[PDB]
């Protein structure tokens, strides 16, 4: 149904190649979810505000999970205290990355996530708010 992205980005193609291998040969559903998410068009990869990451990390038993955002993580000045955590994202805005590091966290790419968490262990995939138009 969908195998290749429409992006001509070389590095996005490398990420798709990497997680294609992982989702072929790991049987962990995280990698399949991420690979499915890599092909999404830009309207279907809404940005995930950094305050949404904090809200996800505020849940029960989710304080130390490594958040994964298959898309762009954006700043949110509406949040003042932000927790120290690890965030794997396709892209970070300068404000979002600066806030994550300022709280003591870390902004890692998706392949660094693949090295650290190859079967997607102890992760938390966030999807941004979707409704843009009709």
């Amino acid at each position: 149904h969908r195998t290749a992205p429409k992006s001509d980005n070389v590095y996005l193609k490398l990420l798709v190649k990497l997680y294609t291998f992982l989702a072929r040969r790991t049987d962990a559903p995280f990698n399949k979810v991420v690979l499915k998410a890599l092909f999404l068009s830009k309207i279907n990869r809404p940005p995930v505000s950094v305050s949404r990451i904090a809200r996800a990390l505020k849940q029960e038993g989710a304080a130390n999970k490594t958040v994964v955002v298959v898309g762009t993580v954006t700043d949110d000045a509406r949040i003042f205290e932000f927790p120290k955590t690890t965030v794997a994202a396709l892209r970070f805005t300068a404000g979002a990355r600066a806030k994550i590091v300022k709280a003591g966290g870390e902004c890692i790419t998706l392949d660094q996530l693949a090295v650290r968490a190859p079967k997607g262990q102890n992760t938390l995939i966030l999807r941004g708010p979707r409704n843009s138009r009709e």
Binding site: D8, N9, V10, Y11
Partner: protein, 51 residues
């Protein structure tokens, strides 16, 4: 740290001086972005033609 780049004199010999590699040489190499920006910018010197 950042790997050093040797500096050659006017006769081609490599002097002892070497320099850190600037951070723009670690920038992502995106042929698609270069392609689209070139193909737009390469239109900016054109002159109008008409009958």
């Amino acid at each position: 740290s950042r790997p050093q780049v040797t500096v050659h004199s006017l006769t081609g010999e490599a002097t002892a001086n070497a320099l850190p590699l600037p951070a723009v040489f670690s920038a992502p190499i995106r042929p698609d972005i270069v392609h689209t920006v070139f193909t737009s910018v390469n239109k900016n010197k054109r002159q109008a033609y008409a009958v």
